């Protein structure tokens, strides 16, 4: 089976990057080719859909440090991204609403990918959605979280997306989110972000049985993305939850 590998990123605009994920997920039709997207953001805090920003992040210190606030479409908690974090998202056809198995399946593909790099990791084991590390959506190199993920599901389609800490600033990450339990892939093995990407293309290909081939977004996906940015992701009402 053939998939679309999208190397699509706007690191200088996190809000547009998130628009892209929502656009690709929302224009997907059951039966389409599965999509693996790789991207980075520059200094950004991304809060979950249901989160109150001021409760989750130090907004004053974000301004001061030129950190972008963005709200994403999925749930889950707040995360700091910079160019040392590799993001990737998967949108595929879905026959069920089994979100637990989606995470488990994607986590397996991650674990297999990291093995290629010589890094031993496992999905966390705890069901407690509010803890910093060791959740079933986290990937743990032993005691250290090296990756988090969130997901959404609807009739016909499912979205999973992750941020892996490759060479992120772990001190800013802790300061922004209002440290001892996170680590970088490079804390373990000497790899570049491109070697990590390549390991993940291979691990997801082998694990999911998909031949991912480089592709670009369609005009329909683009246009939806631009529309979502224009009407939603670029606004303060969306990002900060302001009413009017």
Curated annotation (Swiss-Prot):
Major location, coarse class? cytoplasm
One annotated GO molecular function = lipoic acid binding
A cellular component annotation (GO) from this entry = cytoplasm
| A Pfam family it matches | LplA-B_cat
Q: Which residues form the BPL/LPL catalytic domain?
A: 30-212
What is this protein for, i.e. what is its function?
Answer: Part of a lipoate-protein ligase complex that catalyzes both the ATP-dependent activation of exogenously supplied lipoate to lipoyl-AMP and the transfer of the activated lipoyl onto the lipoyl domains of lipoate-dependent enzymes. Can also use octanoate as substrate.
Question: What name does this protein carry?
Answer: Lipoate-protein ligase A subunit 1
Q: Which gene encodes it?
A: lplA
């Amino acid at each position: 089976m053939e998939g679309r590998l999208l190397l699509l990123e706007t690191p200088g605009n996190t809000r547009m990057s998130l628009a892209y994920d929502e656009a690709i997920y929302r224009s997907f039709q059951y039966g389409d080719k599965p999509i693996l997207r790789f991207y980075r953001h520059d200094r950004s805090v991304i809060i979950g859909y249901f989160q109150v920003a001021e409760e989750e992040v130090d907004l004053d210190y974000m301004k001061k440090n030129g950190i972008m606030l963005a709200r994403r479409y999925t749930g889950g908690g707040a995360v700091y991204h910079d160019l040392g974090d590799l993001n990737f998202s998967v949108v595929r056809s879905s026959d069920d609403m089994d979100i637990t198995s989606m995470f488990r399946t994607m986590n397996e593909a991650v674990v297999n990918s990291l093995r290629i790099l010589g890094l031993d990791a496992r999905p966390g084991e705890l069901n407690d959605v509010s803890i910093p590390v060791n959740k079933k959506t986290d990937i743990m190199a032993g005691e250290k979280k090296i990756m988090g993920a969130a997901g959404a599901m609807r009739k016909g389609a499912k979205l999973w997306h992750a941020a892996m800490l490759v060479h992120t600033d772990l001190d800013m990450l802790s300061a922004v989110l209002k440290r001892e339990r996170v680590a970088n892939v490079t804390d373990f093995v000497d790899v570049s972000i491109d070697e990590v990407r390549n390991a993940l293309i291979r691990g997801f290909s082998e694990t999911l049985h998909i031949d991912f081939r480089e592709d670009t977004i369609t005009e329909k996906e683009e246009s939806l993305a631009r529309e979502l940015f224009d009407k939603k992701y670029s606004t303060e009402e969306w990002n900060m939850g302001l009413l009017r």
